[PDB]
Write a protein that binds this DNA or RNA. Structure first.
Lengths: 77, 116, 134, 149
RNA sequence: CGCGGGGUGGAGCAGCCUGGUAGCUCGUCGGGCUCAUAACCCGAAGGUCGUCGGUUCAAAUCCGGCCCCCGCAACCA
RNA sequence: UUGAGCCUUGAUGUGUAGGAUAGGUGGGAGGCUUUGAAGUGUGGACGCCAGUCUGCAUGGAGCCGACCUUGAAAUACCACCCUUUAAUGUUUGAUGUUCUAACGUUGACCCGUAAUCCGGGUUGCGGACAGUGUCUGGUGGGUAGUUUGACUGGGGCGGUC
RNA sequence: CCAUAGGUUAAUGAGGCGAACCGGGGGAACUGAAACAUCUAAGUACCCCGAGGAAAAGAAAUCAACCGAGAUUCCCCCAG
């Protein structure tokens, strides 16, 4: 589904408030992208479906430190 | 300015109007003047005199380039030809060579039927 | 364009080094090395202009030192220019003399000023370049 | 994005400064090519003690150990037979592993990642000189003919 | 509720930016022309620029206002 | 390539009176020079072509202040900067060209594998475009929710409120 | 090449059903406004997931008014 594998963002819902405030339902989709990440430890490329915020987390924490907790949540990258 | 010394004068002496374009050797235009621009709207531009003032009005449109050597390329049937070259010679240009580049087809395109 | 007098001056006065309170008062004395005593040229870069004449400031300096109670004139593009004394007067004399104009200009407030009066001053020894005191 | 360097680079950095590059330049190119490592504080202290002279200058000497394997191709002149037409007109031009494995049996152990061709894929017949960057600093230069088989 | 734009002899257009040195196109009249009309060339008569204030050694142009026509996007008593 | 801002040597705008390519007032009425002058030759640049300028350097230790008539004071030193230029550095932007390493591949080949999916691997071509997310203007009876007055010699039309 | 992907075998656990309550993910319209769109109806009906005998919450980055009070939950008042 449309979930980020790092942060776990989900397609939340909301309203399309018009100018006259007619509320019609909508969805917010969380900017997902498939991106290959070079893990230096495993000496390979791991492809993850991350959001754009998830790349900044991988650019702030370690890739393998992030990938350590995908192992902890039972994700299967 | 580029200040080029040798240039080419093209003369489009058509039946109704004459266009004098002074270029460099490569062909890039520097300045021009026609008989219609010099006044003479109507029958007066089809005369040799309006061709003469058109060449003079083109000579002082390339004063900023300092051209001294002109090769003339006349083209067309009009009465401009044998008067607009004399205006360049009096204008203080050295006529290096004259040629006519009048486009004559080797017989093919149908010309118009015109003018009964 | 520039010769041996301001050749020594214009790299000894640093007009793009905008000085502090107790900095610029003495470093401009070397720029008056002529046969005649040179005076001050003050340019308080103001927030005034002659868009219309309601943004005009005239006045005077009630100064006990002087050149003398010196008056001044307005410019249209919004520069003041005064003269409050000589530079062969002693070094710290210029400190109270420069800010005596600003206590004279704080009470000289323009009525169509939509903004602060001064931004920063630059002065000169009448023959050199600009010394940017506060 | 602050990042510290491991090779020199083809540009601004010089092994030990921490330049601030755009985040796509670091993440996609510098770190998987091993020319950089991200500059958290535990890596900056890893740089001065561990990295800075120990095996950082293993790389330049091994580059200088390849700077004569730069010119272990003492012949630099290899012809390759591939069938053509009369007067040029090759059937199939040799590529770049077709020229890398050609020099493998006749000189240097080079794959096509290290072969740089100036003009296309060398379609025609004659002695033409293909460049060789096995090295990161200076190229090598190898004359190559191709005749009909 | 706000961005800039156009208003010039009876009728239509430039020169606005880079300030002084109001020009043309037609229609009206006066000549020349022609067997006559048309066309054509020369000269002239008609406006001081929608209106109100500014400054300068000089403004019909620039500075704001004010009026009409806009071309739009804006607009929840 | 290149605006646009910005640092700074350097640069700009003669109606006329009448020597005066000078922005406004002055400060102050002399800078200046032998860590080698006025007058000049020119490469140019600029140009209402009116007129000023500077560089190899000739010449080579003197030029010149309000005086002259001026509505004005003289880049002879001048402050800050006005219209426009300047090159150095910066700042991004604008396109343009090329690259490859993201990303695409419903190209080829290998493997998982007895498999037209899929994944991985080589490789080719594209390539920072494409595409997707958030925000945003336009379009939008494709769809949806609804409105579309009352009196009235029946209602509509006409009229009226 | 290594190594991973895959394969085989064993061990352990899950799956499904069930009335209400509970937490979460989605989420109407008729209706009311004497029409109707904001708004109501209502985060109700319903769908889906998950769990327990209860579940949820829960030990202050909370309130208070400079006096103080001391996690959450529920009831009565404040107060229509």
């Amino acid at each position: 589904s449309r979930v980020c594998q790092v942060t776990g963002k989900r397609p939340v819902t909301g309203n399309n408030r018009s100018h006259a405030l007619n509320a019609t339902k909508r969805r917010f989709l969380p900017n997902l992208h498939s991106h290959r990440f070079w893990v230096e430890s495993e000496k390979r490329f791991v492809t993850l479906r991350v959001s754009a915020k998830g790349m900044r987390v991988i650019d702030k924490k370690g890739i393998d430190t992030v990938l350590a907790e995908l192992r902890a949540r039972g994700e299967k990258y | 300015r580029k200040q080029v010394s040798d240039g080419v004068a093209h003369i489009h002496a058509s039946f109704n109007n004459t266009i004098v374009t002074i270029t460099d050797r490569q062909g890039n235009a520097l300045g021009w003047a026609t008989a219609g621009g010099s006044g003479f709207r109507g029958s007066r531009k089809s005369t040799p005199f309006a061709a003469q003032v058109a060449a003079e009005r083109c000579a002082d449109a390339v004063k900023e380039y300092g051209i001294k050597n002109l090769e003339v390329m006349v083209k067309g049937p009009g009465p401009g030809r044998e008067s607009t070259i004399r205006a360049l010679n009096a204008a203080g240009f050295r006529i290096t060579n004259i040629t006519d580049v009048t486009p004559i087809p080797h017989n093919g395109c149908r010309p118009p039927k015109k003018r009964r | 364009k520039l010769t041996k007098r301001m050749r020594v001056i214009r790299e000894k006065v640093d007009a793009t080094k905008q000085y502090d309170i107790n900095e610029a008062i003495a470093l401009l004395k070397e720029l008056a090395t002529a046969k005649f005593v040179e005076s001050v040229d003050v340019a308080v870069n103001l927030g005034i202009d002659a868009r219309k004449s309601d943004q005009n400031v005239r006045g005077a300096t009630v100064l006990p030192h002087g050149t003398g109670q010196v008056r001044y004139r307005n410019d249209k593009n919004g520069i003041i220019h005064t003269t409050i004394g000589k530079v062969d007067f002693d070094a710290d004399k210029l400190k109270e003399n420069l800010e005596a104009l600003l206590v004279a200009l704080k009470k000289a407030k323009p009525t169509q000023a939509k903004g602060v009066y001064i931004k920063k001053v630059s002065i000169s020894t009448t023959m050199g370049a600009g010394v940017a005191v506060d | 994005m602050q990042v510290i360097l491991l090779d020199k680079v083809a540009n601004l950095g010089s092994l030990g400064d921490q330049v601030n590059v755009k985040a796509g330049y670091a993440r996609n190119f510098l770190v998987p090519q091993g020319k950089a490592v991200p500059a958290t504080k535990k890596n900056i202290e890893f740089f001065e003690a561990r990295r800075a002279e120990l095996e950082a200058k293993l790389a330049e000497v091994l580059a200088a150990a390849n700077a004569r394997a730069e010119k272990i191709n003492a012949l630099e002149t290899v012809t390759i037979a591939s069938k053509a037409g009369d007067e040029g007109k090759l059937f199939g031009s040799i590529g770049t592993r077709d020229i890398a494995d050609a020099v493998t049996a006749a000189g240097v152990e080079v794959a096509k990642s290290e072969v740089r061709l100036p003009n296309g894929v060398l379609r025609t017949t004659g002695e033409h000189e293909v460049s060789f960057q096995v090295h990161s600093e200076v190229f090598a230069k190898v004359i190559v003919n191709v005749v009909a088989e």
